[PDB]
Design a protein around this ligand. Structure first.
Ligand code: NA
Ligand code: NA
Ligand code: NA
Ligand code: NA
Ligand code: NA
Ligand code: NA
Ligand code: NA
Ligand code: NA
Lengths: 424, 424
């Protein structure tokens, strides 16, 4: 019934740890300040160092962070579908959402700190700090699983834009904590309280410029009394080794009566594929690198999609199986998936409208208690055909709505889940 | 002739190391703020951890920091004697003076940074940062030699009081560097520019209160335009295992015609003792712990004291010898030695009146270039008889002026040198 996670290796172990130097602060530079674009290869090459040498302890921590990441991802994915999110489908990144939540937790104090911990499904003992998550162990374990994911060009980049009102000063230890989540961190100041819509225009133009990513960011304005926005931007890029684009276009059914003609990619490899008898769906796994897997889930028929989605995406992956690979001809739409949601909305959908509300104790973020506006998570996920265009096998053809997940075998972390209703 | 030290292990090795977050700062709390006294046992127990586990590399660094510490100590001891320092004698701590100099170096930029490096006798290549000292390696190597020194109650405590004018903000990375020199670091703000004498009264009362040390601090006022004072306070405490106080009092000759009757301690042990034939002085070494040694140097006669002092305290310890220990009855004054000097005065005596002068680039200390007043080093050195009062051996009796040094065998670091002219 009520599942609890007991991530012992991510807790504080020294009661004493939890007559003081005043904490140091800085003022972020204005959003207009000249900034070099993020180098996605420099980020990659680093994350790869941070997964290279790992003792047994590190893998124990990475296994426990995986469980909390997945569970919270499943819960927020459920919140996402209840709020409704565009016709093309849904997409969510548990590592990014989880990273966001842990960043706030690092800036928070009670009651907010234990409320974030409860959300994450870890028990709290009122009075006992050694039952509390150590956010630094958590972010460090999350960095390692990001590293394991990306071991030809296989990219995942997380960028954080931290937008504050003029005069709001950030605490040093807070921002140094955020660097563990991602080194690509841009604290910037701008006038939030006079033209919400142009403030969003500035953030969108800023993000496009430091990343070069074509993301379709939301255009809605910031609430005029916001002093802190915390936006997380995710770029995933994979190549399908040996898949190439097929000639012309092919029917993809949006539902039983409506089709769209789209470009498909196709490839033949040794993949794993099974049919689930109990619930009547099938699954295909294609490797993206040495540790990453793409899972493609097909309902037997279109009207069974919601039932299947709710089975499989909601807390262990009881349904992942490990059959012998077999010769498979896989045909699917080239995936260029864009998504964005405000964590505030998902939290409100989860009956926690005020967790990050006006009374949240976030006093470890800066010099005053911030007043948090949006907390966006945005994704660009790109699966590219590994080859240009121009033997017995089983045909799997994704020509109607399906679900997908990108998954890392060692930790068990789901890095993405989603649903394609209409590629376009 | 011109000696140069080439401490390769203390330099920067990565040229790249030497589009930026604004640096974080804080305002120190006012000098009146309620402060718990330093725990000298908590400091000791830590320094002892920091010397416990040390790879070969660490000892290589510690050997090189020793050379720079000794040489600069010898040079400043010479500066001290040229300026003249009270009738009872002289005392200087090379580790404390060196630590002070390196702290400034960490806060400095060119030309000041290379001028501090030149002072320390290390070559500089204009343009090449990999010829520069890495202050963090330096302070860390200095921490380890402090640790080796203190391995029954054998104490050495270094406290730093960093006194700034109201509104002057310290940089975070600067103060975190200073913590490597000593964790007992008290940045405090007070009005310097209205009553220099009461400002010194406040600092003296502050220091007495956080330490409990009876130090006889200087009473001179701060120059009215000072915004930064950097004062280092040193407490050394040793017990002479098996020495006890002798009945009554005994003649100590201040020069050939004048004596003072003082209490002496005395003890019989296996100590090392030799006569230097070439220069006609003798030396006795008594162990203070497992790594520390006291060296007692006697000139053959009182008028030869200056000559001998200048031979022995000015850059290698060519004159330290290692004979078989022998039965020695050592009689000497109980030593309670107090000393204080302003590094500014010694620097001016060394023809560097402006190294830390008004134009010194110290922009990595805080938000404005500080204007440095005094840089005091003060010492309380206490050698206690190891027992209360009530067998053939050689009598060594220190009944006229002599020199002393406290020395650590592994690194070769001199932690104190001095001269006793009059114990009182
Ligand atoms: Na652990
Ligand atoms: Na801090
Ligand atoms: Na385990
Ligand atoms: Na924490
Ligand atoms: Na080295
Ligand atoms: Na900093
Ligand atoms: Na060597
Ligand atoms: Na340095």
């Amino acid at each position: 019934d009520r599942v609890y996670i007991h991530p012992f290796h991510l807790l504080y172990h020294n009661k004493s740890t939890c007559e003081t130097l005043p904490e140091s602060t800085f003022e972020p530079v204005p959003i207009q300040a000249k900034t070099s674009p993020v180098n996605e290869k420099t980020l990659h090459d680093q994350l790869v160092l941070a997964a290279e040498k790992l003792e047994d302890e590190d893998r124990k921590r990475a296994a426990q962070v995986a469980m909390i990441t997945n569970f919270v991802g499943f819960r927020m994915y459920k919140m996402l579908n209840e709020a409704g999110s565009g016709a093309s489908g849904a997409i969510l990144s548990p590592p990014a959402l989880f990273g966001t939540l842990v960043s706030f937790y690092l800036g928070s104090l009670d009651p907010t700190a234990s409320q974030l911990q409860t959300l994450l499904d870890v028990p709290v003992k009122e009075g006992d700090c050694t039952s509390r998550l150590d956010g630094h162990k958590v972010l460090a374990a999350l960095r390692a699983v990001q590293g394991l994911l990306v071991t030809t060009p296989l990219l995942q980049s997380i960028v954080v834009g931290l937008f504050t009102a003029p005069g709001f000063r950030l605490k040093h230890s807070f921002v140094q904590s955020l660097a563990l989540f991602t080194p690509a961190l841009f604290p910037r100041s701008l006038d939030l309280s006079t033209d919400p819509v142009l403030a969003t225009e500035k953030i969108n133009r800023f993000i496009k410029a430091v990343t070069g990513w074509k993301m379709n960011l939301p255009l809605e304005g910031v609430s005029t009394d916001s002093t802190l926005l915390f936006n997380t931007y995710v770029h995933f890029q994979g190549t399908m080794r040996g898949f190439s684009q097929l000639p012309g276009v092919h029917e993809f059914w949006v539902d039983n009566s409506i089709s769209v003609s789209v470009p498909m990619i196709s490839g033949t490899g040794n993949f794993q594929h099974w049919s689930d008898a109990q619930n009547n769906f099938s699954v295909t796994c294609v490797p993206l690198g040495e540790r990453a897997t793409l899972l493609l889930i097909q309902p037997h028929c279109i009207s069974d999609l919601d039932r299947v989605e709710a089975l499989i995406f909601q807390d262990l992956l009881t349904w992942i199986e490990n059959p012998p690979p077999r010769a498979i001809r896989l045909t699917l739409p080239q995936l260029e998936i864009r998504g964005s949601y405000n964590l505030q909305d998902l939290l409100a959908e989860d009956k926690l409208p005020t967790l990050l509300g006006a009374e949240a104790n976030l006093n470890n973020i800066g010099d005053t208690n911030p007043r948090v506006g949006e907390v966006l998570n945005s994704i660009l996920l790109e699966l590219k055909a590994g080859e240009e265009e121009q033997p017995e096998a089983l045909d799997v053809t994704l020509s109607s709505p399906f679900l997908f997940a990108i998954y890392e075998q060692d930790s068990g972390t789901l890095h993405f889940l989603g649903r394609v209703n209409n590629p376009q």
